[PDB]
Amino acid sequence: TGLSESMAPGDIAELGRSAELAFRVRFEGALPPREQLYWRALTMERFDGRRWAQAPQWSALHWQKRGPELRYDVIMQPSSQPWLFALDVAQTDQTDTRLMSDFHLQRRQPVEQRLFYRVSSWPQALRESSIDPRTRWRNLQLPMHGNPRARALADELRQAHAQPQALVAALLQRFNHEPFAYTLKPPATGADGVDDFLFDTRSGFCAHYAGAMAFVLRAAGIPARVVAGYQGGELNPAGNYLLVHQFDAHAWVEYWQPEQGWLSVDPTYQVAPERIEQ
């Protein structure tokens, strides 16, 4: 019926089949291009071998406004969850909502009735040029056992690429140069689900790419997490608004380094750029 605190690919696929409305958005000025419309809901910082899940957050979070400010109104359908949707980094007019330590908005109560809120976002904000130690630590967590081939790949990438930007670029280039497939009905994978996807099936959808990428970054010593939300939306020119449906559900990645802070990346773009762009 909506996003939840945990993500396995099957949950995202189920949202992919639903035509239910998640929210509608009206921008104060021009509509941003589709590829900037990443509606962040929550982050998933725990990986247990099988799925990515939300960890506990707290509220000072170090960030700095810079670049353009986007202003828009949202009317949200009931989700039964306490997170609000918004472009990163968001501030809202809701006095019962706070920007949490993973840059997601948490409301005091779950959204059980339609809700209107106003938002200002800074998509180019500097996020944690210095990081909270709990956050850095948490975002390097992996199970000690399982997915050994992906861990081996991470070790290789770490040796060849001392700088995180270069390592991330090489991992993205693997998705782009190897013949990975983007499909909503991929082959099943086993207990080493990261290894199976990366090396054997090489076929999946946004959740596979996001999860595997965050896994390999962590195993290479770069803090990383999965971001869950929606991307894109359908324009209704008669009302000057966008509709965002459950089928717009999407997962991506962000990774941390000193000074530059958190940077977002969508590995789906390496295999299905048309889905993101159009």
Q: Catalogue the long-range contacts made by 235-243 (C-beta closer than 8 Å, 24 or more residues apart).
A: 235/31, 239/26, 240/26, 241/24, 241/25, 241/26, 242/24, 242/25, 242/26, 242/31, 242/37, 243/21, 243/24
Binds ligand EMC by CB under 6 A, chosen from 160, 170, 181, 184: 184
- The answer to whether 205 contacts ligand EMC (rule: CB under 6 A) is yes
- The answer to whether 41 contacts ligand EMC (rule: CB under 6 A) is no
- The answer to whether 52 contacts ligand EMC (rule: CB under 6 A) is no
- The answer to whether 51 contacts ligand EMC (rule: CB under 6 A) is no
Binds ligand EMC by CB under 6 A, chosen from 2, 5, 6, 13: 13
Q: Is 73 a catalytic residue?
A: no
What sign results for the dihedral spanned by CA atoms 30, 35, 39, 40? negative
Residue 1, token pair as written in the block: 């019926």
Pick the catalytic residue from 104, 208, 245, 250: 250
Residues 236-265, interacting with ligand EMC (CB under 6 A): 249-250
Q: Is 104 a catalytic residue?
A: no
Q: How far is CA 24 from CA 38, 107, 244, in A?
A: 14, 18, 6
Given a contact cutoff of 8 angstroms between Cβ atoms, the answer to whether 239 and 213 are in contact is no
The stretch near ligand EMC (CB under 6 A) out of 7-15, 95-103, 190-198, 219-227 is 7-15
Chain breaks in the chain (C to N over 2.5 A) after: 59
State which residue, 46 or 250, has the beta carbon closest to ligand EMC.
250
Query: Amino acid identity, residue 259?
Result: E
Q: Which residues on adjacent β-strands are paired with residue 83?
A: 106
Tell me the closest approach of the beta carbon of residue 99 to ligand EMC, in angstroms. Answer: 25
- The answer to whether 16 contacts ligand EMC (rule: CB under 6 A) is yes
b/e map 149-166, b = 16+ CB within 10 Å: ebbebbeebbeebeebee
Given a contact cutoff of 8 angstroms between Cβ atoms, the answer to whether 238 and 272 are in contact is no
Given a contact cutoff of 8 angstroms between Cβ atoms, the answer to whether 63 and 126 are in contact is yes
Binding residues for ligand EMC, rule CB under 6 A, total 9
Q: Is 250 a catalytic residue?
A: yes
Instruction: Please give the biggest Cα pair distance in the chain.
Output: 55
- The answer to whether 206 contacts ligand EMC (rule: CB under 6 A) is yes
- The answer to whether 219 contacts ligand EMC (rule: CB under 6 A) is no
State which residue, 15 or 168, has the beta carbon closest to ligand EMC.
15
The stretch near ligand EMC (CB under 6 A) out of 11-19, 97-105, 121-129, 258-266 is 11-19
Q: Which residues are catalytic?
A: 206, 250, 266
Binding site residues, ligand EMC, CB under 6 A:
12-13, 15-16, 184, 205-206, 249-250
